[PDB]
Amino acid sequence: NYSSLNRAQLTFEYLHTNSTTHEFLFGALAELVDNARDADATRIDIYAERREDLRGGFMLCFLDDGAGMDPSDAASVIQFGKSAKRTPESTQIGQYGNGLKSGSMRIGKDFILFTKKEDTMTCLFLSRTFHEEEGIDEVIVPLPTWNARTREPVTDNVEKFAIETELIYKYSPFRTEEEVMTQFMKIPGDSGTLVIIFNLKLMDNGEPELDIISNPRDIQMAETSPEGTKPERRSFRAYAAVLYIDPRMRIFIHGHKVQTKRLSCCLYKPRMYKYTSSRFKTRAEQELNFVFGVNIEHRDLDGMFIYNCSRLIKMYEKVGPQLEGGMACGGVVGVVDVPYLVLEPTHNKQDFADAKEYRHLLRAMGEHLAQYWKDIAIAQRGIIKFWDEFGYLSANWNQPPSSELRYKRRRAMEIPTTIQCDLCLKWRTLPFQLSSYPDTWVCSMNPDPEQDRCEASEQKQKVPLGTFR
Amino acid sequence: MAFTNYSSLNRAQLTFEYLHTNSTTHEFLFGALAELVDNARDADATRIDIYAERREDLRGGFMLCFLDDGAGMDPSDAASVIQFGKSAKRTPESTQIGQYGNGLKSGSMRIGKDFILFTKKEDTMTCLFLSRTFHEEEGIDEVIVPLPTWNARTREPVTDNVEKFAIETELIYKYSPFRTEEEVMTQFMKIPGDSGTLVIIFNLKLMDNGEPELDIISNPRDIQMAETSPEGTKPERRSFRAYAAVLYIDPRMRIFIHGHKVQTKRLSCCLYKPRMYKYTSSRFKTRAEQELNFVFGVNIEHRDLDGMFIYNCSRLIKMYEKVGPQLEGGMACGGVVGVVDVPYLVLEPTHNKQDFADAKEYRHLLRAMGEHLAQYWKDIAIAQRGIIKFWDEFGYLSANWNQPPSSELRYKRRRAMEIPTTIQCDLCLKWRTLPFYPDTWVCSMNDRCEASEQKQKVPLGTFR
Ligand SMILES: Nc1ncnc2c1ncn2[C@@H]1O[C@H](COP(=O)(O)OP(=O)(O)NP(=O)(O)O)[C@@H](O)[C@H]1O
Ligand SMILES: Nc1ncnc2c1ncn2[C@@H]1O[C@H](COP(=O)(O)OP(=O)(O)NP(=O)(O)O)[C@@H](O)[C@H]1O
Ligand SMILES: [Mg+2]
Ligand SMILES: [Mg+2]
Ligand SMILES: [Zn+2]
Ligand SMILES: [Zn+2]
């Protein structure tokens, strides 16, 4: 019996400490997006409710239709390190039992989480404002639960429930049980979770770091856009478009669907490479698919995109010839999905915990990328002439090519444009040319007579496998 | 300032797996080690000894021991160690590196499965035992941490609960490298002064091949990363001796690795034609309502070891960061080492203290540094000489850039005439410049220990 022994405890300042892991704020947001995906949500809505009385002038809301959380799961949310997703063969991104807390405390001072399950709706309130105002060094988290049908309290302690609800009304954007019930009603199905981050972090100028004004359809970083800054790093729409290698959950930003894209599908001459990783085999004792392709659309947006369990960890990583001053292998996008048995993510899921094995994987990627360069033989065809074939005659490299319809279609018909249905969530390849943000497309709108119906099996692209060496 | 009682409300809690979660912040293992080195420095230690005690029965084959002569810890501070986020150092105008109340735990759990910390203060000897082995063996999901205290003089237990003390000591004897109170007191006696702390990380993480990540065999004087060092690998990233040599911009604590002193070096003190630059940051001015010194110089000794070294509160956060012309294709500003000490009011470190929490303001600082580095290049005006000719004057006549310069005594002395070799006394910790060593050196071996530390004030350049 170890009841009398000391326990490691969380202090209020540890919320900020944990939040410090996210120097990439879109990574903090991706924590909540990953949680929604793990919850089997078919849909996550990322929108802002204007609130001029709250720091930043608006709340950041993550509404998903996933499995939600019963009171036990909601309580486990504040068990740092607790992750039921940490399971063998798990396809769930979450493993560290930390992402929600770290990301939410990076995004804003306070977050209030509304979750609904079979017949229970639970509110989880993490208010650093409450802690600072009332001088609390622990991390006290109200966790009231109502019956999702009767809306009556579900508690073994009416005193505790009253204190929790009064704290919510005092320190949250919602001053009454009626406003709280409105938030719950925003969860339309039998299950789902709404995470509202409010009192958002301000920059030096007093403006919120998240800019939702420049583009009402996007969550942007409040900061200038250098010529080399990447859309996935300045635009959360662009980030969420590639956040997952297997996009199944629909992402909506300010009510506008994010056009998720598989980076492999948008490349010229893709060649998959089966790398028999000694790391993977050693931890099996206890293969990887490198997909390389030329980004004719944006030769600037080249680099390795390393996913870990379908979730983007590294983006625009330069490997192999991309590291040298010569542009050889320039414009090539590499994508690899690394399972947990090969690599684990860092604390913020923006890097890999095992630096040595990540370096080994990057070296393997560089070797296979050089092999891909030799295989496609566009150097044998002439690299600059190949680029000119798609309108890249500008002396500069990064900025896009001449957008005249000639080269536009030359690139388009070399890129099989795929789309996802808004109802069955399956991905289809279209035989025509799209006109333009995404639509509410469904399988019924596919002119392809072979797959024009909803029940049609997903015709899966099979990248032509290449052999290393 | 609470309106009511919150005893019944749920508290966020640490689970056993959160130890690993926290440890995952350190993809850089030497950063995990630097957490303990920073703690020793914050404890005002004059020296920290980083040595390996061979233990074939423990995973990795040896224990990693951090022995410092700092202020140590009374039982209250030792208890506060496991209060995640608790940092008494997090105070206004604090020179102490620690602010997040996390470094020890994150770094120790990154380095090894278990760590046992022995700390001594006025008359108390406290042991803090963080044993993930114990938790795994006994199915503990919380983080239970034994924290027995002995009277440093009588060696008697200091506890308000003899049952708790007995359980803590039995857990230590069962799951730690030290199976008896005699061995525990032997560890305590390794703290020779009235105060100090000994942190022993054991059951070290193994690589895939079953070897420990920390290689203490290739170089018995160094703690190395167990891995091949490609041409571009940096010594500070593969050698912990090299890392600790530059871990702090103000080296005052002596660092010994395997009993061998680390020759700490101020990167700004060994550059050719250094020019400090006064940069005023609106963030600094604001949070003062609540200047930065960019030092640029040419690394003639190793022009390949060039880049910005960003220190935060005297502690290295970013190393070899490329800014300004260093990012383009060409050797303009090549070989330039830039050093800046950013106070906490200007930037805060990330969770692992290997990056800066405010990415936007870090980018602003890097842009300012690049502008000032271009200014430095125009100021020294190597066009007077030509970049290649200037490099050749110091032995860089090889067509390649990365490879070191000529070892001929001519060029060696040519370089030495530009970099006044500075030395730190082993008795008073003061730094002296000699006109013209591994074991030790004092002011008498030049001057005396009572002489004021002459400061090498860099010339001041002008930006625009
Ligand atoms: N949107 C959500 N829907 C359902 N359950 C959720 C949601 N967000 C969080 N949870 C639950 O709360 C737990 C804690 O979240 P989090 O702190 O992100 O840990 P994790 O997701 O398990 N692991 P990681 O994200 O790698 O730290 C999750 O593991 C889920 O059980
Ligand atoms: N070697 C040491 N000597 C004395 N006190 C120490 C030592 N190591 C740790 N401590 C104490 O234990 C506390 C917790 O250590 P740590 O987890 O490193 O947090 P911190 O050093 O306060 N801040 P950070 O390193 O930024 O997380 C310190 O703040 C000190 O009070
Ligand atoms: Mg998560
Ligand atoms: Mg510390
Ligand atoms: Zn369909
Ligand atoms: Zn002296």
Short mmCIF file of N, CA, C and O and ligand atoms in Angstrom, two decimals, chain A residues 31 34-35 38 85 94 99-100, ligand 3:
data_model
loop_
_atom_site.label_atom_id
_atom_site.label_comp_id
_atom_site.label_asym_id
_atom_site.label_seq_id
_atom_site.Cartn_x
_atom_site.Cartn_y
_atom_site.Cartn_z
N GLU A 31 -3.89 19.29 -32.66
CA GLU A 31 -4.17 18.39 -31.55
C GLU A 31 -5.67 18.13 -31.43
O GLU A 31 -6.11 16.97 -31.33
N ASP A 34 -6.93 16.16 -34.44
CA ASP A 34 -6.57 14.76 -34.28
C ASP A 34 -7.49 14.07 -33.29
O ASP A 34 -7.86 12.91 -33.49
N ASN A 35 -7.84 14.75 -32.20
CA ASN A 35 -8.76 14.15 -31.24
C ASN A 35 -10.11 13.89 -31.88
O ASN A 35 -10.72 12.83 -31.66
N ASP A 38 -9.73 10.85 -34.11
CA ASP A 38 -9.68 9.64 -33.29
C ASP A 38 -11.05 9.28 -32.76
O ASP A 38 -11.36 8.10 -32.58
N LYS A 85 -6.34 5.34 -26.43
CA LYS A 85 -5.92 5.13 -27.81
C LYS A 85 -4.55 4.47 -27.90
O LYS A 85 -4.21 3.93 -28.96
N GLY A 94 -3.83 9.79 -31.25
CA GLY A 94 -3.51 10.09 -29.87
C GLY A 94 -2.80 8.93 -29.20
O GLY A 94 -3.25 7.78 -29.28
N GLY A 99 -2.46 15.87 -25.94
CA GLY A 99 -2.61 16.80 -27.04
C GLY A 99 -3.65 17.87 -26.79
O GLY A 99 -3.42 19.05 -27.03
N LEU A 100 -4.83 17.47 -26.30
CA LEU A 100 -5.89 18.44 -26.07
C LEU A 100 -5.41 19.53 -25.12
O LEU A 100 -5.55 20.72 -25.40
MG MG C 3 -5.09 14.13 -28.63
#
